[PDB]
């Protein structure tokens, strides 16, 4: 219940700004269907079906000490939130409906009050809220009205909306999973084994014709807009270079001659032959990680493969 | 079609009239005759003639096609192929040929829908090509003058008849000598 927003150049959270929130409700993704009805047949063909948009709603109110200040506070809200600038929203929850604790009415152990006139139930460090999950959402704002209930309390009804892709982009790459350097950004929503360096954590293999990958993301990383990015030290010289993959298509690189120690950066629908001067004419096919086991099969025992990606959720 | 270039109607050159099998119930009609021709033999004069006939009772089937991917994938339509259509409650089981196809492909080269036309490409497109041919043949010329046209054509034609008159005079004057 804070509605964190990471904008291009800053980080903001509402309750820091005197802005309590009632709740956050996140719709699912609007499935746009594409059916076609045959003329006299009791059944209609599916041309397609496709996720579109994940409309968020967040009603937030605010109290202040005096009626004038309402105006300022409201303006702050707009200047703080209503941003066409695609932002990264992060949801927050509490772990408990906190109450005031027992005290002693002996002219001592009195109660605290926040900067806003409320009772601080958060006595200890471990009371305040948490990033409930290690993911974000690429988000933009839609129109709000501000009904002023009595006093200094005024409500607002934010209506956020997904920007590019209706998915729960996981923050942090898969290499931070590999190297346990960055802390946070890994919630139990992702069923992740502790065996760092073990299987289903590793995306850095060496000297293999074929290997195994566990894509922890329920949603499939077929869309190029996702940050799926591979880089391979090819290991062995060749004239052509095929690699296959399951839950995806076959990939070739024919017609250009390579060398062993040369490396390929295989970005989404894009191929850096040696990091620059992209040679992407050969078999334009992009790979697709669906969920769980995504087994790959090279053909000449690359001396290194490693690939970072982002986990996406539905 | 065998009269010489300078005659134009003294109908030498394989005078004939043909007809198709359906004629006998419909009866006496006829199209623009094969007037223009420098072709000697008669084998030609029946083939081209029946072709002028059978090209005209026109049938354009501008149906719509909808691709099934999970099922029936082996139907990538390509123009200039044979196909066996059959519509119940229409009186139709014959086979035809594609003459137009219209594909769309969003991404990954997956098809969304197809449109096709059979036999003759359309009535529609025939009209439109007629219009555009008129509008481009015109404006490629230079003799056109919208304010009182036909000066450019009548000047020419009267010049032609005048030189023919002078040639008649020359003919008489030479036959004199």
From TrEMBL, chain A:
UniProt-listed InterPro entries: Siphovirus-type_tail_N
Identify the residues that the record assigns to the Siphovirus-type tail component RIFT-related domain, covering every copy.
Answer: 7-161
Provide an example Pfam family for this protein.
Sipho_tail
UniProt-recorded name of the protein:
Siphovirus-type tail component RIFT-related domain-containing protein
From TrEMBL, chain B:
What top-level branch of life does the organism fall under?
Answer: Viruses
Q: What is this protein called?
A: Peptidase
Q: Which organism is it from?
A: Staphylococcus phage 80alpha
